[PDB]
Amino acid sequence: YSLFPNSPKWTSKVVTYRIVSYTRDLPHITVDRLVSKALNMWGKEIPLHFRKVVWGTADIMIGFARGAHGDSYPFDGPGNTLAHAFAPGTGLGGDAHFDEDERWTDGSSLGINFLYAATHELGHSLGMGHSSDPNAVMYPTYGNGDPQNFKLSQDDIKGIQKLYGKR
Numbered sequence: 001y002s003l004f005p006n007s008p009k010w011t012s013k014v015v016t017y018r019i020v021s022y023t024r025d026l027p028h029i030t031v032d033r034l035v036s037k038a039l040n041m042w043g044k045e046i047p048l049h050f051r052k053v054v055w056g057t058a059d060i061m062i063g064f065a066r067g068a069h070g071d072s073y074p075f076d077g078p079g080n081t082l083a084h085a086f087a088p089g090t091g092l093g094g095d096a097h098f099d100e101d102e103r104w105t106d107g108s109s110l111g112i113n114f115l116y117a118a119t120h121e122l123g124h125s126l127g128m129g130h131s132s133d134p135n136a137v138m139y140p141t142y143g144n145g146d147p148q149n150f151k152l153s154q155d156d157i158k159g160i161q162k163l164y165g166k167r
């Protein structure tokens with residue numbers, strides 16, 4: 001595993017998040033469930049707790065967008081970059097954006113598995129960098145293992161716990 005330079009991390013006991021926009025590919029209820037699932041995958045290993053808010057600012061702002069969307073990291077259409085997240089910090093820090101030009105799926109269809117993509121992106125939102133281990137969720141490319149049957153690897157757990165300590 002690798003953390004970000006200067007290992008930024010959330011210092012609060014609870015970190016909020018808010019889904020600002022949704023994808024046309026899934027029901028809104030599924031995205032909400034999958035984001036909670038993804039945050040819990042990491043939360044289970046550490047002292048943090050998460051709370052969803054539906055208005056204003058949240059530490060982790062989540063949204064779907066196609067093309068240019070304000071932050072100077074335009075999406076590129078179907079394929080290639082699927083999504084991108086930023087290291088913990090104020091403003092854009094900690095946010096996670098998903099390329100709406102992708103065909104998002106809960107796993108029952110062809111497309112990009114949103115639970116897997118959200119686990120990777122929220123890993124970045126928490127301060128995780130990329131792993132060299134092809135089996136890790138934090139590996140840079142999609143598809144090595146099985147998007148429909150996966151869990152954090154020992155490498156991902158070692159990294160998140162180094163950053164925030166064990167629960």
Ligand SMILES: CC(C)C[C@H](CS(C)(=N)=N)C(=O)N[C@H]1Cc2cn(c3ccccc23)CCCCCCNC1=O
Pocket residue numbers: 079080081082083084085116117120121124139140141142
């Ligand atoms: C790990 C994921 C959940 C999310 C990451 C998000 S990121 C930014 N936060 N590390 C991602 O988008 N990875 C790209 C990386 C990537 C793979 N290729 C690319 C060709 C061009 C540009 C990027 C890529 C070659 C094949 C392209 C096919 C599309 C699959 N794309 C990827 O796997």
Ligand SMILES: [Ca+2]
Pocket residue numbers: 058059060061089090091092093094095
């Ligand atoms: Ca933020």
Ligand SMILES: [Ca+2]
Pocket residue numbers: 075076077078079080081082083099101102
């Ligand atoms: Ca894309």
Ligand SMILES: [Zn+2]
Pocket residue numbers: 069071073084097
């Ligand atoms: Zn963005």
Ligand SMILES: [Zn+2]
Pocket residue numbers: 120124130138139140
């Ligand atoms: Zn990544």
